[PDB]
């Protein structure tokens, strides 16, 4: 009813905004800054997750009918959007740390395409980390009175290990890297007069840092509840506390709502690049 309608609305808005920003950035692709190309790549890592909405819309309408391959692709895309976002934001925050504190940047004055190879490497890591979702997803009929719904299918022995490795990597390497880099950036920026020596090469640096920090705060605020929920799940499966077989509905609805919020982040990004920074 309402779910297909809002899925269609999200698809339209996200596709329009992300296509617009990608075209705007690519119109001047002959020469791009490091921040500009990182934003371009985390937008092309998001257009795919926007494209995959109508599948879930028709799934919520009647039933999944597309097949196993489309299910694998959709699951892999959802699990790769977060990895691409986290790794790209960690790289951009490390670049900001290099520019601010040490002032020894080499992306533009060094090798011509260091940024391109870094992005290719993070794409490779994203695909390698998404392989477990590629290999363990199928459209099982489940024999539930015509209820062919996409779901994982594990031997139940390595599910906890896979979940804990996913959480550790994707929410503890980028988290620590970004926290350290931004702590040092703020410490160096609260107690300095001029970055380099100028008043025209210092203002734009602060503007760029403002844009990047609002982007990463939006990303964290959108993608944190899902990982907190999965952390609660993995702690529950290890027999830590609060196992009572009564909160399963709560964790399921929490997973659903956090997945919805992660889907909304796609349309949140372009308007953020729109109103601030003009």
């Amino acid at each position: 009813a309402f779910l297909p309608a809002l899925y269609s609305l999200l698809f339209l808005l996200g596709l329009l905004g992300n296509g617009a920003v990608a075209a705007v950035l690519l119109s001047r692709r002959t020469a791009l800054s490091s921040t500009d190309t990182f934003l371009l790549h985390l937008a092309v890592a998001d257009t795919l997750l926007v494209l995959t909405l109508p599948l879930w819309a028709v799934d919520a309408a009647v039933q999944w009918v597309f097949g196993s391959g489309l299910c694998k692709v959709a699951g892999a895309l959802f699990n790769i959007n977060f990895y691409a976002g986290a790794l790209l934001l960690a790289c951009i925050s490390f670049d900001r740390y290099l520019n601010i504190v040490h002032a020894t940047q080499l992306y533009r004055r060094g090798p011509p395409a260091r940024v391109t190879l870094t992005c290719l490497a993070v794409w490779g890591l994203c695909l390698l980390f998404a392989l477990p979702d590629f290999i363990f997803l199928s459209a099982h009929h489940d024999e539930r009175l015509n209820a062919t719904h996409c779901q994982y299918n594990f031997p139940q022995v390595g599910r906890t290990a896979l979940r804990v490795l996913q959480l550790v990597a994707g929410f503890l390497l980028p988290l620590l890297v970004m926290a350290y880099c931004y702590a040092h950036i703020l410490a160096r920026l609260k107690s300095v007069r001029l970055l380099s020596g100028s008043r025209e090469k210092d203002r734009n640096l602060r503007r760029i840092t403002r844009l990047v920090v609002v982007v990463v705060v939006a990303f964290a605020l959108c993608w944190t509840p899902y990982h907190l929920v999965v952390l609660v799940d993995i702690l529950m499966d290890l027999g830590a506390l609060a196992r009572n077989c009564g909160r399963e509905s709560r964790v399921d609805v929490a997973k659903s709502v956090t997945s919805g919020l992660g889907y909304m982040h796609c349309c949140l990004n372009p308007l953020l690049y729109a109103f601030v920074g003009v």
């Epitope: 920026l189 609260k190 007069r193 001029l194 008043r199 210092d202 203002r203 602060r206 503007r207 840092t209 403002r210």
Partner: nanobody
Framework: QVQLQESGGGLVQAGESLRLSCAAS????????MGWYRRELVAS???????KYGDSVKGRFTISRDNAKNTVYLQMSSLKPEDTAVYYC???????????????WGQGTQVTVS
């Protein structure tokens, strides 16, 4: 968006000493530099306590700063009639952590000796 209060100027006899005080108020995130100018600098002090004087000053004038009140003071001893001029307080400030550094001059004061 910065108000500068200047005090200390007025009538004084020759061969005496005077104290000029300049204070800054408003929505300021931080203050970095301060100084006094006649179009040329006479005494400048940074946030780190370093003091710079012009070529026409033989270390006679004393410049001090108080960051608690964000107030700068300039003491001149053994004044001369040639010191009769107009002195303008200066200040460099940042109004926000993401904002450009920019400076705002003061109204100015008149100093006359003998």
């Amino acid at each position: 968006q910065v108000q500068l209060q200047e005090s200390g100027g007025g009538l004084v006899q020759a061969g005496e000493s005077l104290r000029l005080s300049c204070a800054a108020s408003g929505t300021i995130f931080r203050l970095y530099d301060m100084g006094w100018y006649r179009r040329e600098l006479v005494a400048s002090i940074t946030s780190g306590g370093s003091t710079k004087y012009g070529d026409s000053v033989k270390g006679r004038f004393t410049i001090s700063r108080d960051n608690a009140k964000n107030t700068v003071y300039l003491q001149m001893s053994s004044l001369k009639p040639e010191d009769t001029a107009v002195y303008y307080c200066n200040a460099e400030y940042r109004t926000g952590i993401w904002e450009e550094l920019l400076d705002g001059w003061g109204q100015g004061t008149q100093v006359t000796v003998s």
